[PDB]
């Protein structure tokens, strides 16, 4: 009877992850498109979804969605505080360690997805791999590893968008029109 | 007992979409009017609508209304972050890829409207079409395709404003005074 | 048991509308008085009223009060985003089309007041005339149309204040001390 | 069972008015002290109080506390948008009309207090007189009326504080330790 | 069943009062440390505590915590609006009259603590003396009274911290580990 | 039935603490990464966690998460109000007293964890040592103590993440997959 906020948070997260990984692949630069999306949709909208998981019983969704929206808000801030002259750019090795800490949080949360749907297990698996590769590629500096991570990132966003659209549509019809792997 | 937030969310979205596409048709430039409406009515007020669907059972309206207010916030942000020297203008091919992803989101969400009224299915069809044409016209650079999508947006906004005003007025009289193609 | 938010929203709307039409009539310039009131009283305070109508059963008041406060916020944003170098001043024609869109919303919402009190039907009719005249007076450029609309706006705002004070004053006494019909 | 939000809103308004009229009486200039208080205590904190009247049954308190908190926000915005290069200075005739609009709102809300406590009736009386004289003194320009209006405001503000500490202290003791109506 | 928000408001108030009075005593200048605390802990967090007293039955705490969180916000604003060129520094005597009004508010609220705990009566007594002395020392120009007010303020802050930790620790253990004076 | 907000608050606190102490250890400078995390994850997200403890019965979690979330926001404000020309950098002895005040708050709240999980007791033990050492290293000026406290801080940050992921994963599986010493 309380709506499911998981699709909103999953859409917010997934769509924004794709755009950032279109840059990481190399097709585009880290644009105001990625930044605006990280502010309002991958951040704010996902924080909303996470807070709405509270009156549902969902500690995982509360812990997950809220944490990743906060991640997108930190990321946009790291990129935009220099353009405001408050902080200097980041150190990519420090940027690498930052992305690594978010990686282990996802690693633990993966074990939390094991009784849930199978698409959900995949988005947490792929997201751990994405963060891992970016942690390596930024600490050592390999542009190649970051290009490979980018392709893993595009898949991650597509999975999360599908899972969200899976949830919303199965609820809408009453039967599982899009397979998820419950 | 809980009010219907859909007319407000539809009004905010619908009115702001008309204004933006009066520019896409070519009659006007991308003004602060579109930006102001995109901030407060197509964005915030629709975000209110999406959040107010939560205590209703409406996962769809929560997912829908909340995401499009966020989109309008991202759009104004992409256009105004350059004026602030935070970001450089954006790649239109990236803008096209951004607008296309929102089209894929609406496309799935249209399939969710299949048991709902007819106008709602129409707004989601034209809105799927709107995002598609603009994404095409922006990746390739066809001013003609963009002038055509502008006309599709004008009808689309008219549909949502009509749907919103239907719902509010059908509720008020107790009989369905405005046809919504239930 | 839940308080009535309509007087707050009507007060915010009405008072803000009077002051803005004191400029549209011509007695004063488009001041920070109008701009402040448009930010906090006709905009924010009315958005509260609209949002407080939600746990009540009131879809009309939710959609109406919330949309008009948002209008006042967009209006102030259109008038103040230039002073900040974010947006060029706006073409009046659009303003007319923008005020015209807000007019059509008000027209439909007028048909929605047909089972409510009488003063409420009047504020929504006169506001429909107000939005309509301004849309015309701005697309065409008639200063005269805008001077007349201002007087329609002063009457509209005074009506919303009167209705608001009716509801609050009728509720307090137990009889309809102010006739609202 | 829900806490009483009137003492907070009364405190926010009352304390802020006292400070502002120490300027209107003439003791001080219109300081940033008044502006800070107008932002956070007579403004935001009272808006909280107004909104907290909603789940209580109190439409009068909702409408009043919420409207005056917004009023204090509009005034600070009117005084500070010039220092920000947004709004030029305000027109004193218009400010008088603006304070006049806020004056009529208080006048009606005064008639709503007729079955309520006695001190509450006084604060709305003095606020009505306060707004009236300031509108008079501002459209007309008598510094003396405004110096006189200020002295009315110090009494108005001191009374609202007195009512607030009454409400809180009478509830706390269970008997009326501080006399109110 | 609702948490007790009083310890949060008492912590914010008390810790911020100590810091400010390390300056009033003379050890330090009115540093940004005092101002940061005044914004977020003595101001914002205490306003949270105050709003949380509403669903409890607690009008005193609602009226108290919410007003003093606002005081700390007005205090920061008085000190930071000149650095923004919005206001010219305050006059003192007006500052003294301002702190004098907060003293009269605190005085009445002291009579309200007479059925509450004994330490609670003390924080309101010493705060009344704190505001009184600072009002005098600022109207009269005595650096000496303002140094004396500083030491009373250090005690006032320490009481609130002890009281807060009594409340939290007594609830946690089930017996009164720290004496308060119920 | 209300989600457990402790993992969110614990994640926010811990992850951000690790990074700030990667600076205290000496590997990195006080980056925009540390500032971004302090704003959104160690600050906002933890205030969220703390406020959600209210409808649960948890006065301790309310007092703790909200106060620390406020701490990161004051610390970010201390580091950023100078970059804006609002305040002058802090005096390190005054910072030391400020961090010491947060230390006594943590010391008392430690006594509040004695019936809780052992890891919970550990995060409060190491956090008390962390504040005490940093308060000492800044009052006296020992860079060495601050290099050592940084190591104690890293351990502390690790615990809070471990406890957070313990809580989430134990609820999710139904058995204690990760030991927390209940
Ligand atoms: C992309 C990272 C942001 C989203 C993090 C994943 C959100 C997972 C929410 O799903 C919910 O998880 C629970 C697990 O059992 C189920 O109770 C519930 O039914 C399922 O719907
Ligand atoms: C103070 C300046 C104007 C701001 C708003 C003041 C409104 C105070 C509301 O009062 C409340 O009204 C109820 C009926 O009116 C009474 O039950 C009660 O006596 C009183 O608690
Ligand atoms: C110094 C400014 C901040 C101080 C504000 C203190 C208000 C706290 C109110 O006390 C709380 O109210 C009841 C009695 O008040 C008790 O039952 C409750 O348990 C107690 O915790």
* DSSP summary, beta strand count of chain A: 0
Q: C-alpha Rg of chain A, in Å?
A: 16 Å
Strand content of chain A: under 5%
What's the number of helices of chain A?
Answer: 6
Oligomeric state of shown chains: homohexamer
Please estimate the helix content of chain A.
over 70%
Biggest interface, CB < 8 A: E-F, 42 and 47 residues
Main sheet of chain A, how many strands, which sense, barrel? none
Pairing-aware structural class of the strands and helices of chain A?
mainly alpha
Characterize the overall form of chain A: globular
How many domains in all of chain A? 1
Q: SSE string of chain A, helix = H, strand = E?
A: HHHHHH
Ligand types? nonyl beta-D-glucopyranoside
**Separation of termini of chain A?**
20 Å
What's the layout of helices and strands?
6 copies of one chain form a homohexamer.
Chain A: H1 6-25, H2 32-52, H3 59-83, H4 92-111, H5 118-139, H6 143-173
Helix pairs in contact in A: 1-2, 1-3, 1-6, 2-3, 4-5, 5-6
Main location (chains A, B, E, F): membrane
Cytoplasmic side (chains A, B, E, F): 1-9, 53-59, 115-118, 166-182
Pfam family, one (chains A, B, E, F): Gpr1_Fun34_YaaH
């Amino acid at each position: 009877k309380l709506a499911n906020p998981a699709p909103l948070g999953l859409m917010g997260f997934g769509m924004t992850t794709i755009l950032l990984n279109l840059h990481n692949v190399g097709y585009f630069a880290l644009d105001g498109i990625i930044l605006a999306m990280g502010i309002f949709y991958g951040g704010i909208a996902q924080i909303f979804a996470g807070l709405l998981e509270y009156k549902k019983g969902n500690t995982f969704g509360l812990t997950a969605f809220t944490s990743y929206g906060s991640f997108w808000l930190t990321l946009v801030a790291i990129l935009l505080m220099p353009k405001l002259g408050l902080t200097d750019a980041p150190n990519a090795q420090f940027l690498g360690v930052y992305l690594g800490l978010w990686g282990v949080f996802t690693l633990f949360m993966f074990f939390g997805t094991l009784k849930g749907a199978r698409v959900l297990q995949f988005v947490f698996f792929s997201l751990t791999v994405l963060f891992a590769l970016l942690a390596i590629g930024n600490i050592a500096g390999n542009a190649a590893i970051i290009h490979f991570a980018g392709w893993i990132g595009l898949i991650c966003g597509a999975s999360a968008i599908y899972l969200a659209m899976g949830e919303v549509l199965n609820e809408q019809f009453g039967r599982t029109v899009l397979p998820i792997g419950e």
